[PDB]
Design a binder for this molecule. Structure first.
Ligand SMILES: O=c1c(O[C@@H]2O[C@H](CO)[C@H](O)[C@H](O)[C@H]2O)c(-c2ccc(O)c(O)c2)oc2cc(O)cc(O)c12
Ligand SMILES: O=c1ccn([C@@H]2O[C@H](COP(=O)(O)OP(=O)(O)O)[C@@H](O)[C@H]2O)c(=O)[nH]1
Length: 453
């Protein structure tokens, strides 16, 4: 029988988009989806709704919170430092969420962040905490062994995995320092960041993650053993095709370059670089001599790309490089045959989009636990990309380190480049295997049915 599932993702494009990809896959199997979205953002989401008769959007008014910029609805609307205020606004949607659940009466609600399970169990609805970040990240920072240390968890503590963690990788000093401090910072309604997610993990009926057994399996197993409740896998949430073909302006421009010759660089929809690293990144791309398309916000303190470019940059790169601030159809750009290299901030959505395509991956994780852990897994475990080197204590890169990583992967005679290409091909063949995503969804839907039994 078909399930009625409500979707309540965090107010961020990197959560809304894969939640909607998954919504489409579930609607193809006959399930009815009630998709909760901030009101103005719904217009930008319609392009991803392939089953409008089964997936219905329900708008949420993002409430005012002192400090939240007027009209803001997603993390793409606010500086990263204002994310906690947007979380307070999510928390404050509780009244309109309660109303929606009582009228719509879904069997299950998928959610982020809102530690909701008390309301749903009052209403006889099953709560499902559904992550689109890596379960390796949650396992590393939010498993019970980490939370019982409370404020005694130091940077030295975070240089080791928690007890029982299933794999090994290394963090740099500045990364463990970042994890140790930001963990304690309030993220919405006075709740420390890791406490919030741990409360969600503890109070929800079941947990799910984007991913497959072959890659995410050890982490989901560890989390199931630690929290003693089902931790499901949805499959890798392969991107669905959009109803909008590639913008002719980009299609024309990309089509002027030889196959596999262009370096595409994008650091997602949320973050802004500081000027000095913006300069180092752009000079590093220029040094390679390959054509490039860099999708970047103007750096901190600047309002236009033009004002922040290194001196003489436009004049030198001419028509071979574009640095662009606006939202583009990244999934369609990565499919274009001109693209030979993807310099990625290692957001989990961008990683999936890179892996299912042919571009060589250069890993430039920004300062966020999931980006860093995705980068270590991709660079050291799957070995599908080359990571740009950062200073151990300062977390900064040089233009020469960007140049070096791109040069390695784009050099047909470089054996590291050939290696990461071969490994990437193996991972793409896995993720696109004719029965991989379907058998993940088969198991996923069987366990959701068990949950509502
Ligand atoms: O990046 C992490 C992350 O997601 C991001 O969190 C950012 C906070 O600044 C932004 O909000 C951003 O948009 C969002 O994607 C979540 C998270 C997601 C969904 C949940 O339901 C939830 O409970 C937790 O947990 C983490 C836990 C870590 O220890 C380290 C991490 O790096 C993350
Ligand atoms: O200009 C842009 C920026 C991002 N994306 C998409 O937005 C999502 C970003 O998710 P990810 O986890 O990679 O990064 P975030 O933006 O959340 O840091 C992915 O599906 C990207 O394809 C896009 O289409 N155009």
């Amino acid at each position: 029988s078909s399930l009625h599932i409500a979707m309540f993702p965090w107010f961020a494009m990197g959560h809304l988009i894969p939640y909607l990809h998954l919504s489409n896959k579930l609607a193809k199997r006959g399930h009815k989806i009630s998709f909760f979205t901030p009101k103005k953002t719904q217009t930008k989401l319609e392009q991803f709704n392939l089953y409008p008769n089964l997936i219905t959007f329900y708008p949420l008014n993002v409430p005012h919170v002192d400090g939240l910029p007027f009209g803001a609805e997603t993390t793409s609307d606010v500086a990263i430092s204002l994310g906690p205020i947007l979380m307070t606004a999510m928390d404050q949607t509780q009244n309109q969420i309660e109303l929606l659940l009582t009228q719509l009466k879904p069997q299950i609600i998928f959610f982020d962040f809102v530690f909701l399970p008390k309301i749903t169990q009052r209403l006889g609805i099953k709560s499902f905490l559904y992550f689109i970040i890596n379960p390796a990240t949650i396992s590393y920072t939010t498993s019970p062994p980490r939370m019982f240390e409370a404020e005694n968890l130091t940077e030295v503590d975070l240089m080791k995995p928690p007890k029982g963690y299933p794999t090994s990788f290394n963090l740099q000093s500045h990364e463990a320092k970042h994890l140790a401090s930001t963990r304690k910072i309030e993220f919405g309604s006075g709740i420390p960041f890791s406490v919030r997610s741990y409360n969600c993990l503890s109070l929800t009926d079941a947990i799910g993650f984007k991913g497959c057994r072959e890659i995410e399996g050890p982490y989901v197993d560890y989390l199931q053993e630690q929290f003693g409740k089902p931790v499901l896998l949805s499959g890798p949430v392969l991107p669905e095709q959009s109803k909008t073909a590639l913008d002719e302006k980009w299609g024309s421009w990309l089509g002027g370059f030889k196959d596999g010759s262009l370096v595409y660089c994008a650091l997602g929809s949320e973050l802004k670089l500081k000027q000095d690293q913006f300069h180092e990144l752009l000079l590093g791309l220029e040094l390679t001599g390959f054509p490039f398309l860099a999708i970047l916000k103007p750096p901190v303190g600047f309002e236009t790309i033009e004002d922040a470019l290194p001196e003489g940059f436009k004049e030198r790169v001419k028509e071979k490089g574009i640095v662009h601030s606006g939202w583009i159809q990244q999934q369609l750009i990565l499919e274009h045959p001109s693209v030979g290299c993807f310099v990625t901030h290692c957001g989990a959505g961008s990683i999936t989009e890179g892996l299912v395509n042919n571009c060589q991956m250069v890993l430039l994780p920004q300062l966020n636990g999931d980006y860093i852990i995705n980068a270590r897994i991709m660079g050291r475990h799957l070995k599908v990309g080359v990571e740009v080197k950062k200073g151990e204590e300062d977390g900064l890169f040089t233009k020469e380190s960007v140049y070096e990583a791109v040069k390695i992967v784009m050099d047909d005679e470089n054996e590291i480049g050939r290696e990461v290409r071969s490994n990437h091909t193996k991972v793409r063949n896995l993720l696109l295997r004719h029965d991989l995503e379907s058998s993940c969804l088969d198991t996923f839907c069987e366990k959701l049915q068990e949950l509502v039994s």
